Design a protein around this ligand. Sequence first.
Ligand SMILES: O=C1CC(I)=CC=N1
Ligand SMILES: O=C1CC(I)=CC=N1
Ligand SMILES: [Cl-]
Length: 130
Amino acid sequence: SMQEEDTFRELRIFLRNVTHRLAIDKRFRVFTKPVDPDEVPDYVTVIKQPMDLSSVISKIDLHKYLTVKDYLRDIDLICSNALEYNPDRDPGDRLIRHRACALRDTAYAIIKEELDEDFEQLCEEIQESR
Ligand SMILES: O=C1CC(I)=CC=N1
Ligand SMILES: O=C1CC(I)=CC=N1
Ligand SMILES: [Cl-]
């Protein structure tokens, strides 16, 4: 229905705003664009599902997210990709891991404060109906 289309449009507006807020944070610059393969040639070797905030915007705009749960799966992938690719004790790896945990924690905290649970439940019920 047009009411269900309106629901998913509201979802996309909400997710674009959360993603924009993460992308303008200087801590998260490293997560804003895909890893340049020249600069890091073994990335795509090790990381099977690369994810970054520009890709998330692209996926919103392609109507790939029908629930906030599906969006948080891609945020969780940005974090787990960084924990897997940068596991060492050296400060460069520890800094990226801390920034990745902070991205994830920030996205979850914005959604805890600003997503209505009944709006999420509606999206989940429309998604399950297809
Ligand atoms: O080693 C890296 C680089 C980048 I850019 C993102 C995640 N891990
Ligand atoms: O880095 C990886 C992880 C997995 I699971 C399969 C292949 N490469
Ligand atoms: Cl830095």
